[PDB]
Design an enzyme around this catalytic site. Structure first.
Site, PDB file in Angstrom:
ATOM      1  N   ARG A   9      35.250 -59.549 -58.476  1.00 25.02           N
ATOM      2  CA  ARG A   9      33.820 -59.573 -58.722  1.00 25.02           C
ATOM      3  C   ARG A   9      33.177 -58.194 -58.683  1.00 25.02           C
ATOM      4  NH1 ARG A   9      29.217 -59.721 -54.471  1.00 25.02           N
ATOM      5  NH2 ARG A   9      27.367 -60.085 -55.782  1.00 25.02           N
ATOM      6  N   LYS A  33      23.794 -68.961 -60.351  1.00 25.42           N
ATOM      7  CA  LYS A  33      23.571 -68.737 -58.930  1.00 25.42           C
ATOM      8  C   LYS A  33      22.266 -69.390 -58.492  1.00 25.42           C
ATOM      9  CE  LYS A  33      24.398 -64.504 -57.551  1.00 25.42           C
ATOM     10  NZ  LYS A  33      24.159 -63.031 -57.572  1.00 25.42           N
ATOM     11  N   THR A  78      28.136 -65.238 -50.256  1.00 24.25           N
ATOM     12  CA  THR A  78      27.032 -64.679 -49.486  1.00 24.25           C
ATOM     13  C   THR A  78      27.347 -64.620 -47.986  1.00 24.25           C
ATOM     14  OG1 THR A  78      26.046 -66.878 -49.878  1.00 24.25           O
ATOM     15  CG2 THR A  78      25.032 -64.994 -51.001  1.00 24.25           C
ATOM     16  N   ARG A 131       9.886 -56.162 -56.949  1.00 27.06           N
ATOM     17  CA  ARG A 131       9.990 -54.996 -56.084  1.00 27.06           C
ATOM     18  C   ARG A 131       8.607 -54.460 -55.751  1.00 27.06           C
ATOM     19  NH1 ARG A 131      15.637 -54.375 -55.547  1.00 27.06           N
ATOM     20  NH2 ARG A 131      14.860 -53.333 -53.664  1.00 27.06           N
TER      21      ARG A 131
END
Lengths: 507, 507, 507, 507
Positions: free
Chosen positions: D49, D246, D304, D96
């Protein structure tokens, strides 16, 4: 939930699946003509049972001849032709009383509580009285004890052992009634040591081999060695004949496992068992044996007065209707009709009701549930055919297939699939005529005899046999074009092995 | 595994538990004497059924008198006394044919395919022929259509509607046979609109109320309103009389839910149902109704020719033996004997075999498994008695109690425990004589009538009734000192509520 | 279907039931003030754990004093007061290394493959080097063999036995890293024969008895005799103190059954186990022990770094969140927080997250399913209390009760109900303060300390205690007026026996 | 019994079956060298990955180059060669913050309760303060409401909406801490309408297509249309690239079904989910999604922070060890390592522990039980391949086969068998290199790339591929000569259809 299953049963919803249970019919003076036999075959008869307790060989040879004449009457149409097996049911070993004071017709009944002596002294053979009774079982005294029970004339009369003489017995008549001559005797719970077959059975069995019968219903089987004896008599020429052991007494039930192991099938003879053991325990014995046979994957037959009443009645009693349905619900492979088809006045209606009850009972069974237990109780195997068989059944449930087509020579592969009780019918295609007939012993198997000539190349011959089954399945309405079916055959030709399963759409 | 359960059944292992299923016996000229009734009670009879299709009131009053005379014969010993209920089974609504050409005895049979006309013209009442048949059902033409089927004389004769005239019908004799006078007619699948009760039923029902009968088996019930009618006729004085609806035809099965809702119990009349619907579907109807009754917690009775053959035979046929066992295995609360005890020559043996078959069948049932489904299908309740009932049953399995003792006035609390089918017997202690008798309708309940006088303080009266049950349980061999039993009573006196469960060791 | 259960889980549906799992918090310098302790109790802390691996008695006495000060702060309101137990977790037996070349702070790391000798010669005590290492376990050589593995400093360093000297061992450093002074040693798979308790443990245990602690978490338990030793030391005055055995090594897991039998509870110390056995097998050991404890009905505690990360973080890692949820899903009675509450900077948030995770995990468990297995694996009993307990749980499911109220003195009856894992919370009413505190060890039990004065008549005292539970249940929101609850008490006063269950509507 | 299953788990019994779960490793500066990659492949890595949140294309191209260099290093031995897939994990859409007062490094933390305004006025971009905060999500105000929660910097900081201005928001700092520049923002429960892919994602995806990657882990998927967008960007040349969505937020979980329907696989991103929804509900979301993916037969990945701690530690924490085991026990197809292999200092040990935990967890699963639910929840099909697949799995259990060999071009047939979770490993033989690599997404599939040249005759080519699998199975120790294996292929050549199953003994 089972209780929830019962609650959902609906009499207004017609049975969809075909009738999986085989129907065995006793043939006699009322169903002996080619004419009636043709109709009985159309009405569902898969096996013709000849009761050798009566009749001459010449009489039976003609019955068998007529059965084959009627059966081959339908061979002009291979797609619809239904194999029909011939079963020989032996008279079997038995204990008979002598003749009461001279003549036989003469009856001398006695009251309960009264005293009665059983003598082995041949001097009293043709001179039986309400005080002295002669029996032909010479070891009677050795297998009985003080307190034992003895039934005379199909259990109509009862007696109890008080004192064990030397070559005789003194007993009190617990029951009562008219006592005739040469009546059948039963020794409940006693280990009767009579030979496995009588001298009459021996000749009848030999006759069966020369008549090329498919199965033999061996009477009074109570131990493995009895089965071997029957097997030995059938000999080399009768080695392919299926031996179905009739459990008729307590010892037979006690040694059931070794008997089942040695047999090809089993028949629960409720009639004789009802005499041999407490009548209230027969339903238990029947359910136990059917269950063990299902677990073992061996044919189990239920009979002995199924639809009796239908001798002069259009429809069966309520107890009989219930009895046949519950027998199939219990897991019986075949249901047998005796008297109702041998004698009676409604042989055709009897066969048809039998068929109707069976398909209704089958529609009311949770097939997937029945299969899960079988695979569960079934052990891990290393036999590829067994594994192929379970995988075919599972695939059958997954796509709700119209049938599982099995190419078989000996019938073994088809039997292996049958033990897992798929919902879809099993179309066993074979070129072996005997295999086709014997297949009816197994519930769910629909045997079809391929007439076509073998094809040079094995691959083409396989497709030929598979397509025959397809046409049969279509013709009989099991499925149609566009449906999916499971096919079981072999990978290669001259190596033999049904380890190949294919899921194919119907042409 | 069920299949594994079947395989483990053993005929050599005596049944341990007592016989939970109730036995109902039809009383007639062969079991009418106080003498025979005393024996029948000792042999297991819990309910005496009087068939009102025949006999005069004076005749029945004497039968009932003798039943109570025999029953009270055992009251001198409260510990062993067994309550015995009296059931009145109505003749019910029916369709009868006229008289064939003058006299009744005169019969005029006809061949199949032949033509036959059904007339409502009263002019042909006493003049019925193989060409003209009179029926007393005036709406016959409105509930039938071209193509309908009509049975005459208990289904012996069959017919099919071709053309629907105005006040008549033309039909082809599908079957055949001797046609007599005033024969019962059946209209399979037709919504017969005859009144819920006949004028004869009305007087019989009234008679039942004055005779203080415990239950009524109402005939030909096919809708809720029919039950209400029966209820209305019994009136205020017969409000406590249990109404058991007899499902005898297709409409009855189709509207079974609303009928069950309105009834106190149900009776599957396989005899009439066998005529009304395809004989092969009766086993399905029986199993469906028993299942729904078990789910609803309402009594269900199976009868209509159980052990028929036992009219002049010592033991039952194999089909009958199987039928009674399977009925109890299906979940029936009571099994009924008709003819076998009303007429026959072996009324006592019949009752005893009935009892033997039932206890064997009960020993062969997986009680814990049967209970899990019941509680599963049973919904969340807010009724404390229902919750107390389930907790008592569970506690009963946990300590394998010798019994669940239930103090009840109306019998309701005992019924609530019975629906969960515990293995342990339910000893319902009551001072209400009628409750004691009616309790037999529920499987597993062993009613005991407490004779002792009420005690000043409720707490002492509770212990008195509980100890009575203890002595009864000991006497009858259900359990002994040192064992554990479940007791269900109330928290406080004059507030009524069976919400208290205690686990107590037997004194 | 389990898979179907997983598929139906919904994060948008708030948990309805209360949090059944107990929460144990290690108390230290960051949660030692009465102020913080008050908040922790409000946030869910049921048990305060004092880690005796560090701290002086005076230090711990003050911690315990503050815990009781904070706990009694809520006694002014009996309805909301929550008992809070005090647990003493022993330092336990251990193997420590000597001092590396003089001072302790001095570290001498070594590279893999390098050689290292383990010496029992006390001459090297304070002079340990990367070539010579002293250990205080004198039987080290007898319980180890060539090829054995040895971990140093919490498994950070690894070694392997090459040659077994007389009073020393030569080993290759399989791993590597900085080696300090007086570090803990582990002998994976070796049957360490150190005494059950150390001399420090002995005094700490004595201290616990005089401080009146409720339970002791005994370290390094690996055989039944170790538990007995701990029991012997607590003596007569500490006989009511619950002994929870900490399974920390391979022998402990191998002899788990005898240890469980001898203990009152179990604690899975994943931290030490992770060193003692292959880290990949710890999840297996945890699940096995939780399962056996649930089967035995004995408390099982999961801890050793649950929400560790929460030392300076607002929320836990994803692995930790998963770990606590799965521990409760596995069936753990209590989850313990160490470090996160003893040290950390978020002791309150840690307790709250613990509580939130637990109630979510509990809402996601199929309670009825969990109960069926327990009763299934549970054997037939003759103990009335056990039977009463199962019946109460069942009745609880049937009416979906708001709670099962249990009056208990020793707590036993409440424990018996807890083993069956009812969905409804168990309100254990007792006047025994210690019972109230110790009850938190069992999942599902909500202990309430009845303040009211005993009533002259037992019957009134029972109603007083039952009504207290009712008010508590209402106050805490477990249920309200009109709901139904199960109550377990006794039949009579001075005879002792919780064999009475009542289903009562909430006042 | 599940509880009984837990009780029987044994840490002393080595795992027999191979590790079925796929291992995905994030590659970074610490596992980027061909040298380390070779070892990681030997240690179990099935998928590499690349995290595109950081790094340049040139940097990633070299990583991919090295991965293929290491992978092809083993191609000299076809029997042992293990395909290794390359996965591209997108940075994805995000919110952000601006730069705090000039420079970025500058941090301005604020205390709880304090006021903070969120502005969309670009004038405050590089001038963020503890009083004013700039965010780049222009629709922030439209998807939020008064009372909403807002996390800043990976949830470290929390805020709550008080008043909704026009192009700004006023909020109270529920939490607190150091606020930096350009930090990631999360809007728990808010339907964020950012485009499915960012402009950076677009180029990265394009790069992936030209680099011939096997799968893409698409970030922030919250609706079906987001998946389509990703699909559209990959275009025609990237149509065979697997898209794994995801699930990272509440909307993603709420619309999971439509997302699963549109995706090829799913990845549970516990890290982001832990921020987006209450941390205590993440375990629920993970279990729900794994369950639905298993039911749908689509790959599900768990990652995760699995073994995070292993950055500078030899062994994982106890919570992490538990987390990986439970993820596989839940039914995850692959477990992913991030950081532990990308950065860390123990990339190899991390992969090995991952492998060890997985095989232990798999040995502890009741395979037959897991399969029964799958087939149960699975519906009746008309697709022959699905039926062949279920039959192969069943046959596999029946003979406890060493493997199910599946010849596949696209991999579909192998995937169909994988959904039924057989115990035996699935050896998927293919000549398509991409299929071989992508197969690792499915648990239980062991892909083998057949090097041999295609054979003229299809029949011979089938035997060649089947024998290759046989040698592989022997080499890898899955089975040996004399064992039995299941083989799935097609009936005829140029017709395509895996509807043929054979049970064959291993050569």
């Amino acid at each position: 939930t089972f209780l929830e299953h019962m609650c959902r049963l609906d009499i207004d919803s017609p049975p969809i699946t075909a009738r999986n249970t085989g129907i065995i019919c006793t043939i006699g003076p009322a169903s002996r003509s080619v004419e009636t036999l043709k109709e009985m075959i159309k009405s569902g008869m898969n096996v013709a049972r000849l009761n050798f307790s009566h009749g001459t060989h010449e009489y039976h040879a003609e019955t068998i001849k007529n059965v084959r004449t009627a059966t081959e009457s339908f061979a002009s149409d291979p797609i619809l032709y239904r194999p029909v097996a011939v079963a020989l049911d032996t008279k079997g070993p038995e204990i008979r009383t002598g003749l009461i004071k001279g003549s036989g017709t003469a009856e001398v009944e006695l009251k309960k509580g009264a005293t009665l002596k059983i003598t082995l002294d041949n001097a009293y053979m043709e001179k039986c009285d309400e005080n002295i009774l002669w029996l032909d079982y010479k070891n009677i005294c050795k297998v009985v004890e003080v307190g034992s029970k003895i039934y005379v004339d199909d259990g109509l009369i009862s007696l109890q052992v008080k004192q064990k003489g030397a070559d005789f017995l003194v007993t009190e008549v617990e029951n009562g009634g008219s006592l005739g001559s040469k009546k059948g005797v039963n020794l409940p719970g006693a280990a009767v040591d009579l030979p496995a077959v009588s001298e009459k059975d021996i000749q009848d069995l030999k006759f069966g081999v020369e008549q090329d019968v498919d199965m033999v219903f061996a009477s009074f089987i109570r131990k493995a060695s009895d089965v071997h004896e029957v097997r030995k008599v059938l000999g080399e020429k009768g080695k392919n004949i299926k031996i179905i052991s009739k459990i008729e007494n307590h010892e037979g039930v006690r040694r059931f496992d070794e008997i089942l192991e040695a047999s090809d099938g089993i028949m629960v003879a409720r009639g004789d068992l009802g005499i041999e053991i407490p009548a209230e325990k027969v339903f238990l014995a029947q359910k136990m044996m059917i269950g063990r046979c299902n677990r073992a994957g061996k044919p189990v037959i239920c009979a002995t007065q199924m639809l009796e009443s239908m001798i002069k009645k259009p429809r069966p009693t309520r107890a009989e209707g219930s009895d046949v349905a519950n027998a199939v619900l219990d897991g019986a492979d075949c249901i047998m009709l005796s008297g109702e088809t041998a004698k009676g006045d409604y042989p055709l209606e009897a066969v048809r009701m039998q068929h109707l009850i069976a398909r209704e009972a089958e529609a009311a069974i949770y097939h997937l549930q029945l299969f899960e237990e079988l695979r569960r109780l079934a052990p891990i195997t290393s036999d590829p055919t067994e594994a192929t068989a379970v995988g075919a059944v599972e695939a059958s449930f997954k796509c709700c297939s119209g049938a599982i087509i099995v190419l078989t020579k000996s019938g073994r592969s088809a039997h292996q699939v049958a033990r897992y009780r798929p919902r879809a019918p099993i179309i066993a295609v074979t070129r072996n005529p005997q295999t086709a007939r014997q297949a009816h012993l197994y519930r769910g198997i629909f045997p079809v005899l391929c007439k076509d000539p073998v094809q040079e190349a094995w691959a083409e011959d396989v497709d030929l046999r598979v397509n025959f089954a397809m046409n049969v399945g279509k013709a009989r309405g099991f499925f149609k074009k566009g449906d999916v079916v499971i096919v079981l055959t072999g990978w290669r030709p001259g190596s033999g092995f049904t380890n190949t399963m294919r899921v194919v759409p119907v042409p």
